[PDB]
Paper text:
FdlA from Flavobacterium sp. SA-0082 is an endo-type fucoidan-degrading enzyme that cleaves the sulfated fuco-glucuronomannan (SFGM) through a lytic mechanism. Our structural, biochemical, and enzymological analyses strongly suggest that FdlA-NTD utilizes catalytic residues different from other β-helix polysaccharide lyases, potentially representing a novel polysaccharide lyase family.
In the WT structure, both Asp137 and Glu236 form hydrogen bonds with Arg272, while Arg272 participates in the shaping of the alkaline pocket. These results suggest that the steric hindrance of Arg272 in the two mutants may interfere with the substrate fully entering the pocket and hence the correct positioning of the glycosidic O atom, thus resulting in the complete loss of activities of D137A and E236A mutants. We found that the inactive FdlA-NTD mutants exhibited similar Kd values as the wild-type form. These binding assay data clearly demonstrated that while our inactive mutants lost their catalytic activity, they maintained their substrate binding ability.
Numbering used by the authors: 1 to 441
The structure:
Amino acid sequence: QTTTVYSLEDLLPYLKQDNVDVKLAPGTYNVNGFDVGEDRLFSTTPLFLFEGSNSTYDFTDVKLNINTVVLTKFGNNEVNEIQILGNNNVLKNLKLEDIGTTAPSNRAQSIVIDGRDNRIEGFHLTIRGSYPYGYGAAFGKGGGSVINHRKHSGVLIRGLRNHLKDCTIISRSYGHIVFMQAASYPTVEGCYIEGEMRSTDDMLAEEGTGSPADKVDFMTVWGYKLPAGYMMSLQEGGIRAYNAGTTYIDGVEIQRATDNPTVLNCTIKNARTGVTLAHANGTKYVEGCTVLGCENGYSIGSGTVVNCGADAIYGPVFKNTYGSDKGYNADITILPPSDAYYNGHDAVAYIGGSNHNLTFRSEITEIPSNLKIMVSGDLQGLRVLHGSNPSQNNFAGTNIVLRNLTNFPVDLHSDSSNITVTSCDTDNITDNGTNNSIEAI
């Protein structure tokens, strides 16, 4: 009852059919510029468009090499390698790798999941080829860019009840690694997501080379010259949810926010953020995750972060997105450093909004001198200096339970009130707020 096919060419017809069970035989399959054309295997993008429903696709031991030149072969159009439009499909075990570093002519996404109740599991994805590569988003990720971009992102989860499970996503590309737009009940489970980092000092060292950053005098979209002393990801987010987007289910076009995301047992390394879901609606749940060397650990806005860990080497493990944040319940272990500290944000956590219940745990005994838990105040975060992104900084914190089971000191700013702090030691806690209560445990 399984059909086995032995070429990309014989695979492509099944993608238009419902209720099929298909296996692409073990092997290595290359897609090159010569394969894209009128006459040719791939006449249109997306390359692999899964239009059927109730189908299973087994790619065990399949290595699919897609030459990045393919991202230029469709004019000025977005190129998608794989898109699922149908429902109730299961794709498993494919190893997909972009070959070379050619940028898209416009933009690209490796995998887009529309429809409902689809699952991608056991994939291994390597994303390459984008422009500019080497500055992350410092010179723009959307309109009004200082340096025009031609982005290439990994997995875009949309649709309803779509699931990415046990996947390895390695990004060497300027774009999101795993992101959700218009997704309702998306689940990301057992995933390993990895980007790579570069110091702003190394970028600034391009002064006088004629580099694209050197040509705009390192002026960022945040309104100031790129500051020294930060470690950035070259990618946009590890797992990031958006409040906008369009998806398609059953031939209906749907424009909505992401809602009800669940992230379980993921490891995110060297990304801008491990898990950011503050812009999703409904119930946000994060459990069993490990965030290593990201610019930011967990920002879910409201909801539940439980049994999660992050290290602090490049940025805070925890950040309330806005003063509007309420009901963020979190239990976060500050993990031993995965590498030397290079955290220019001067904070292990930034807390405000109201009615949160936050527990931080750590075995760390050597505390860098610039790192503290902040309740309110002026965060020295790369993106929020000098009034940039003003709603994401300098905001009040009220009625918050803060269990500091760590040796990190705590700084309660004058805008904080009714913070109930319990701590290993209470002599590293600076209280400049109102009606805050400090108690040793």
